[PDB]
Amino acid sequence: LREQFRVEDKDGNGYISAAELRIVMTNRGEPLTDEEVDELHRETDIDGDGQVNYEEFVQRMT
Numbered sequence: 001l002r003e004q005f006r007v008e009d010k011d012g013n014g015y016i017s018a019a020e021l022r023i024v025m026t027n028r029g030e031p032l033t034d035e036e037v038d039e040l041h042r043e044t045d046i047d048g049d050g051q052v053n054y055e056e057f058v059q060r061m062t
């Protein structure tokens with residue numbers, strides 16, 4: 001979990017941004033449009049501040 005978050009959090013700022021997530025999903029060839037990835041990100045972003053923090057990332061993966 002921590003390692004996976006670190007991989008996605010490309011700039012190391014303790015958040016996964018929507019742009020970082022689009023890079024993640026493209027890098028592994030997921031069959032999702034950028035817009036669908038944006039919706040995944042927004043639903044994972046419980047507090048709505050535009051960033052997926054580690055707590056949110058854990059709730060998603062669980």
Ligand SMILES: O=[N+]([O-])c1ccc2[nH]nnc2c1
Pocket residue numbers: 008016021024040041042044045052057060
């Ligand atoms: O931040 N996310 O919304 C999110 C959702 C699904 C994922 N799968 N792998 N990393 C993921 C990140």
Ligand SMILES: [Ca+2]
Pocket residue numbers: 008009010011012013014015016017020
């Ligand atoms: Ca980041």
Ligand SMILES: [Ca+2]
Pocket residue numbers: 045046047048049050051052053056
């Ligand atoms: Ca958030």
